[PDB]
Amino acid sequence: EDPPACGSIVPRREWRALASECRERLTRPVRYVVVSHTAGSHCDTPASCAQQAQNVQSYHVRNLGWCDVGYNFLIGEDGLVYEGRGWNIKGAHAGPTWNPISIGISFMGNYMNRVPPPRALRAAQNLLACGVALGALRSNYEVKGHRDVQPTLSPGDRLYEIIQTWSHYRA
């Protein structure tokens, strides 16, 4: 019934992100969502996750030389979502074919033999519903696992197994 009717996100300033230099935009409404995992260590507190988001971005910006952390959003096990490039900026998370047409959300950690806590799954699914309500994502958007569009084990066997059951999943 009123404008800002969706999910909470930790803003860039809050997790002390380096300023983005990316300018290429995505065309909303976006149809695809690609779920990946950072494949590294997980975090489970606002404190550790903010730090983890800073490290992921550092690697992408410092080492890979990218304009900003590749993901549009990051999901910490603290149950919070971390603002990446956002709903309107093209990400670098699934290749030249899917980057310009999807939203890349990455779960912080490695989920090959471990599943994310319920609160992390709720945060991600709450975020997608937020993207629909805002008009950032199509009402009939499609969820893919990173390994469905790129050769990689991401988002991890256990997590990949989870998203396959999701309402919007379409391999």
Place this chain on the structure above:
Amino acid sequence: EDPPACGSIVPRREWRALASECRERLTRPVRYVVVSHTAGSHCDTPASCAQQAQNVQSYHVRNLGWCDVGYNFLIGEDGLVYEGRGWNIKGAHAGPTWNPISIGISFMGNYMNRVPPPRALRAAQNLLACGVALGALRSNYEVKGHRDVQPTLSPGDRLYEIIQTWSHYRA
């Protein structure tokens, strides 16, 4: 005008590869080589390695819908090099910025907690030496680990540790 027959490479026909639909070419001499691992199961016999190469290609062609296996060459633990897209066709292994200026060689297996056997490493260095002798690679080519140009664990912790010591490795 010197022609060296230093190719102990297993032809696509020999490992029963599906025909390639790729047509884009690489401009020789190529300056970079990006080393990755398939992060899948490894193989130590010509027979099992031809089969694993088939699987890797099947994943890329049938699941990802690609023209061919993304790597220019694959390295088996059987100590043999398996022909991928070859020296002249641009591969799909390190992104839009690196694919067109590099040769991607991938070790079949996951090297986070395993090192490839000496014979696999010998195969890879001999393959790169052969590339220089043919004119396909610059004599002063630079080797990069996959994780140095893209966010990923590839080529695995132990293998990455090994290639960082290589003469041609560059930050």
Place this chain on the structure above:
Amino acid sequence: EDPPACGSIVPRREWRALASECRERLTRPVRYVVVSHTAGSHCDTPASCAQQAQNVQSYHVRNLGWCDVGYNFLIGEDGLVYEGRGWNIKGAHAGPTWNPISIGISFMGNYMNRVPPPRALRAAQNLLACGVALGALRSNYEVKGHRDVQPTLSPGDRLYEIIQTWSHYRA
């Protein structure tokens, strides 16, 4: 295969096409689409365009000796798509290398100094979407300029600039 017959295409019979003698088939689904221009006269009415398509086929058949108009489909400035050899038959528009693995669509007119009207651009893009829907083209098909696969001016500088901005365009 899939219920929806897609897009509005002017049937061969409607533009008074000479019967085709072509028999070689394409392998479904097709990966490539080569965009060309006829470099001939443009037409902006259903009548003038049915005539020009007849003229193009006439030149190809009667003067070049081809089994039919070499293009799989023709686009008119009248905003309609004119059926050539169709989705299932191999055309003659990009040479011995590409003809066997691509769909050739051609805009009727010379676009070195002119751009095709928006209706022609929309007709071309919906035809392709239709090809994908029909299973004739791969979901991840790639669009190429005629100049990218053969040494030619086709499809003309102005049109070439436009197809480069297309989502499925790959240099």
Place this chain on the structure above:
Amino acid sequence: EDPPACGSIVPRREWRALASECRERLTRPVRYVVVSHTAGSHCDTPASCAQQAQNVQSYHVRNLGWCDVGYNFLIGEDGLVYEGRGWNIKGAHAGPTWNPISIGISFMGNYMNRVPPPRALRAAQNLLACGVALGALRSNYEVKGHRDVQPTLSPGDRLYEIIQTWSHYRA
């Protein structure tokens, strides 16, 4: 900024439409499609037809005081479809009972003693199929004539007998 709309519909702005002031919405997917003729002048080219859509709109807006042209979509004899109120906005073409539950498509011209060209009929069929793909029309919708729901000879005797032969028509 991505690929354009299906059915190759000439956008409002392309046929130089006055801005719409309508707000009442239909709840897609819609169950009915009512076919009428404008009983106005006919046109057979993109230029003439854009002018006629302007004429029809001008009459409904300037003279009848409507928020926009009554029809959701207009079909020209040039074989193109012209965007009227579109898929989401309730039209004014079949009265208070039928306007809120149907999509109204109108053939530009008088068809009492004339049949519209095959392409105009194809554009109409193509428009309806693209409505389902978009999710605006019920995958299994129903088609009615103007005289089947209102006391009028619209869409004309000739055009009326043709739509009766359609596969989605309902008594």
